[PDB]
Design a protein around this nucleic acid. Structure first.
Ligand SMILES: [Mg+2]
Length: 1002
RNA sequence: UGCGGCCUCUACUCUGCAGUUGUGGAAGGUCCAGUUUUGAGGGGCUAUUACAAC
RNA sequence: UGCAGAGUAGAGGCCGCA
């Protein structure tokens, strides 16, 4: 078999990127080894899989972890492993599949790495009909070809390509006989490669595709651009972009190294502006492919970026804005600062929660001595000596369940509140002063913008102090219908139990009703499950029915729960014994069950459950009170609330739940005073409405234009009632005005929809009752309607959130850079903005910490839209070693980007210099030709040795050549002192020049 | 070779759920509707945030 | 990470028709 001509003609590029490919693979395998505490197919992680399929599994938990992460870091492995299963019958992918795919991929990658990085070696593996070809290479070519079929299908989903745009590939890959691979196709992944046996091998394009599975997207683009693989399509063609996208769609995801940026007022401003240019995710799903495409932008460094919001970062951004701005004197937000682990066999975790400004808390979290706060306990990064320790995590705000928790300090400039640790075991936390809904944060921001943060803060603190005064009075039993108004809290902001208590209507929930209802519901479900079966459930239910004693200390604990859920005469005994050991105050029915298999056990469990619940129902029907179940009459839920007891729980035990519409009255009073707001009826004006009116009437602004684009919703499809030829519902894209009108007419339109839809269901014989169909449609319309309504409500919220970020960011930058804003407007903001604030040029400075060092990257002038460049540079593996060479931790952004592009151009030229050196050595010394012919491994290292001994090179020169060559293979810079260098951006160029000169002979 | 129906398998996207006990439904989630394109309001349901103890 | 539903795309088997 001959090496493909593409490979032979582009050897320097295949050489470079094959090396990069194999290093990237090792990196992933190494990472998995570390995290899971245990010739790349002999790697510990790969050995594990090899043995996992064959022998009895000693840790299935580890096997399954390895298989899950391998598929995370190598996304193509999902497709190839699924094809390997089918190839082989079991339903699911097994360690053998994963092992076989990767053994072959690695084997062929290694082969081509060796051929392309060596002037001459005699490769036995290329001999026609050999073991390597028959067992590894030829199977892989077929696998790769089948992989690509699916990759092209994924292109439709990922980038919204249509059949017409992919047909230039999809229609021409295979040729029909009676089916066959069209080896004449320009992008054919298989060829005969002059094999006399006439078996399909990987083609050159095939080898390029294999390599690109193991590259980053940036390097896929650099690599493929140097190959003539695009027939006649030109640099700017859509076809070229399709080809390149197809070669990256499922490529390696590398584990990313830790970065910690220093934040500032300016940085937070810029984080907010770069957030508002992105599409909200709830909006993006509703948009046509055309308009979704408008968020796919090309960066400065010619990289495609999807400008879409991962998540709603409005609230954290606002908290950073307040902290770094030092805008609240007394309020501090709830931060987590890691976890305490102690050994006490299980390990127990406790979160290290506290309150302070994110910066100040972070300064306290990690001492110079590497201990936490004032604790003494080591921050790490079955041995009792290793415990206790604290998991290393950067201070972040706690934001769960749509809440923001706070602590109110009496005095200004208070220190961070970190938890005390006791007995190296207990983390003594603080109940937050109060808790606010994340939905309240827009109005707070608006209040802050209109009045100032200090006035905003005074209002939060005053509201908090009113609730406290109320709860104190409850504890003295001094709250009446007569005096409730004096506490200054509106009825709609008081708990219902207080309102019940003052009205003389205090009651618990009715236990008897609840038990009667629960028993009936559960009996019905039991029969549903019995029927479904004849036609973690069990672990949850077994514990549900386990009686509690001694504050619940008797019930099944975490580890034993996991074992129970996961869990021949002896085998039967063993299974029964488990429930004896778990002491199942007994489970009410389980003992009746006691068999041969899980399936028998589930059936018997359900029958016995049915008999138990029937008994209970029958006793309820006799009017009897029963008590056996998991409902517990002594819980306060079921008792009447008392003023004094509830007063104490509200004051001492819980945070104050702050009300919604805290800031409304003050916002409205302000706006009423402005003459621009003269028209507005403030009796029908919510804060979402008023934000929009403010920016249109006071600021001559409007929301981003992408909130006006047409949107798709299934429910609106159903209401529009338009069908294709075959009779499927059409996907409409409506305007808001259209949907307003459909919604008004939803009753009529739903009637029509159901009539037609029912008729279409009846066509199928499998489904044949009438009421069966009515239920199917009921659920169809409810679910769809609910999805639509929620989506539209949330998008409206994103609009005003963006208004607020824009306003705050603009305020920061106006005062800071001394730039000329005032003219800038949210309506101008767009993902690729060519005008307005995002296009303004400003000096910038980005400071970050990586691998225990602290660096700064500057710009004397930079468009605000490009602020994301800094993270791309900081993330780069080379940044560390490069700045070691520069001899400064402070550097220009432009210089580093130029350096990195020049490095990228030098790397293949290094490969070429090596090649020509090896060639010289082979031409001079004929001993090596013999060593090749008798199949002996010659390396660069070997050639250097011959050059050294026969006095062509000296040790110094040998060491330099070796070290530079190694640095480039690593995709990194060499250590300081190896070679004399120039300044940025010519460091890589100067290293290349040295290598070139040290590779000339004596 | 084209078209229609039925069955099986695979992929992608979107929505819902996950130690024990206690406390808490002014908040959050969800459901209903002659409600909202103004996270506003009404009615039902529900321990989700947190903290203590194991 | 395990489980359920809906929409979309693709492949295989069977039948009828041109
Ligand atoms: Mg309200």
């Amino acid at each position: 078999m001959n090496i493909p001509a593409l490979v032979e003609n582009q050897k320097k590029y295949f050489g470079t990127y094959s090396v990069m490919a194999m290093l990237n693979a090792q990196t992933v395998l190494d990472h998995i080894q570390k995290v899971a505490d245990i010739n790349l197919w002999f790697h510990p992680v790969m050995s594990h899989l090899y043995n996992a399929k064959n022998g009895y599994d000693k840790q299935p938990e580890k096997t399954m972890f390895i298989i899950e992460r391998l598929q995370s870091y190598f996304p193509f492995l999902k497709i190839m492993a699924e094809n390997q299963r089918e190839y082989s019958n079991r339903v699911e992918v097994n360690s053998n599949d994963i092992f076989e795919v990767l053994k072959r991929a690695f084997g062929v990658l290694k082969m081509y790495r060796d051929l392309t990085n060596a002037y001459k070696t005699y490769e036995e593996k290329l001999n026609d009909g050999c073991e390597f070809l028959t067992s590894t290479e030829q199977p892989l070519s077929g696998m790769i070809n089948n992989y690509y079929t699916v990759a092209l299908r994924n292109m439709n989903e990922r980038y919204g390509y249509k059949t017409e745009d992919l047909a230039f590939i999809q229609d021409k890959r295979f040729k029909f006989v009676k089916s066959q691979v069209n080896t004449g196709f320009f992008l054919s992944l298989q060829d005969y490669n002059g094999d006399t046996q006439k078996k399909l091998h990987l083609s050159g394009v095939g080898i390029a595709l294999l390599i690109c599975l193991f590259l980053d997207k940036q390097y896929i683009n650099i690599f493929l651009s140097r190959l003539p693989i695009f027939s006649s399509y030109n640099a700017q063609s859509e076809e070229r972009r399709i080809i390149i996208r197809s070669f990256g769609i499922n490529s390696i995801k590398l584990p990313k190294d830790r970065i910690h940026s220093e934040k500032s007022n300016k940085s937070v401003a810029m984080d907010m502006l770069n957030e508002v240019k992105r599409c909200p995710d709830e909006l993006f799903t509703t948009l046509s492919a055309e308009k979704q495409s408008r968020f796919r932008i090309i960066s400065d460094d010619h990289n495609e970026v999807l400008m879409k919001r991962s998540s709603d970062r409005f609230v954290p951004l606002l908290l950073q804005y307040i902290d770094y701005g030092k805008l609240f004197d007394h309020i501090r937000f709830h931060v987590n600062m890691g976890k305490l682990r102690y050994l006490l066999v299980r390990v127990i975790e406790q979160p290290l929660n506290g309150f302070g400004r994110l910066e100040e808390a972070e300064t306290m979290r990690k001492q110079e001595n590497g201990t936490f706060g004032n604790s003494g306990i080591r921050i790490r990064d079955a041995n009792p000596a290793n415990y206790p320790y604290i998991v290393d995590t950067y201070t972040h705000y706690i934001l769960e369940n749509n809440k923001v928790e706070m602590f109110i300090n009496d005095k200004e400039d208070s220190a961070p509140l970190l938890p005390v640790i006791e007995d190296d075991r207990y983390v003594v936390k603080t109940i937050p002063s109060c808790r606010m809904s994340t939905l309240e944060i827009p109005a707070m921001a608006f209040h802050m913008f209109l009045f100032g943060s200090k006035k905003t803060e005074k209002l939060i603190v005053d509201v908090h102090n009113r609730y406290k005064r109320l709860f104190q009075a409850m504890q003295k039993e001094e709250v009446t219908a007569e005096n409730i108004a004096s506490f200054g809290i509106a009825e709609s902001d008081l708990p219902q139990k207080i309102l019940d208590l003052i009205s003389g209507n205090a009651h618990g929930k009715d236990v008897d009703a609840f038990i009667r209802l629960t028993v009936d519901d559960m009996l019905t479900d039991t029969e549903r499950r019995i029927k479904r079966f004849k036609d973690d459930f069990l672990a949850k239910d077994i514990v549900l029915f386990q009686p509690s004693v001694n504050d619940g200390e008797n019930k099944i604990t975490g580890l034993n729960y996991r074992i129970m859920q996961s869990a021949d005469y002896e085998a039967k005994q063993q299974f029964k014994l488990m429930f004896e050991k778990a002491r199942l105050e007994p489970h009410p029915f389980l003992y009746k069950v006691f068999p041969a298999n899980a399936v028998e056990f589930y059936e018997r469990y359900l029958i016995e459950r049915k008999f138990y619940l029937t008994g209970l129902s029958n006793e309820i029907k006799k009017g009897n009170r029963v008590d056996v179940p998991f409902i517990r009459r002594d819980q306060n839920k079921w008792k009447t609330p008392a003023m004094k007891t509830l007063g104490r729980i509200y004051s001492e035990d819980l945070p104050v739940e702050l009300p919604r519409q805290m800031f409304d009255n003050e916002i409205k009073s302000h706006l009423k005073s402005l003459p621009q707001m003269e028209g507005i009826d403030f009796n029908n004006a919510n804060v979402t409405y008023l934000i929009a009116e403010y920016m249109k009437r006071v600021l001559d602004d409007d929301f981003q234009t992408f909130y006006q684009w047409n949107r798709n919703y299934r429910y609106m499809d159903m209401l529009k009632g338009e069908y294709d030829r075959k009779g499927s519902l059409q996907h409409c894209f409506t305007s808001v005005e259209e949907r307003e009108g459909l919604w008004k007419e939803r009753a009529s339109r739903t009637e029509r929809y159901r009539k037609q839809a029912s008729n279409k269901i009846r066509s199928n014989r499998q489904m044949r009752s009438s009421e069966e169909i009515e239920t199917i449609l009921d659920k169809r319309l409810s679910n769809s309607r609910n999805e639509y309504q929620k989506s539209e409500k949330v998008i409206r919220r994103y609009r005003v959130q963006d208004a607020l970020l824009f306003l705050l960011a603009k305020k920061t930058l106006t005062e800071l850079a001394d730039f000329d804003g005032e003219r800038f407007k949210l309506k101008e903001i767009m993902p690729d903005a060519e005008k307005g604030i995002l296009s303004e040029i400003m000096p910038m400075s980005f400071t970050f910490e990586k691998g225990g060092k602290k660096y700064t990257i500057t710009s004397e002038g930079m468009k605000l839209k490009n602020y994301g460049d800094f993270f791309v540079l900081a993330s780069d593996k080379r940044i560390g070693n490069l700045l070691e060479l520069v001899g400064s931790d402070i550097v220009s952004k432009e210089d580093i980007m130029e350096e990195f592009n020049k490095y990228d151009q030098c790397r293949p030229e290094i490969s070429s210099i090596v090649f020509n050196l090896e060639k010289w050595a082979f031409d001079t010394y004929p001993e090596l030709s013999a060593r090749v012919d008798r199949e002996e491994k010659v390396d660069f290292k070997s050639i250097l040795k011959i050059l050294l001994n026969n006095k062509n090179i000296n040790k110094e020169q040998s060491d330099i050549l070796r070290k530079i060559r190694n640095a480039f293979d690593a995709n990194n810079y060499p250590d300081k002192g190896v070679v004399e260098i120039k300044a940025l951006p010519e460091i890589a160029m100067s290293i290349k020049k040295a290598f070139g000169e040290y590779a000339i002979m004596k």
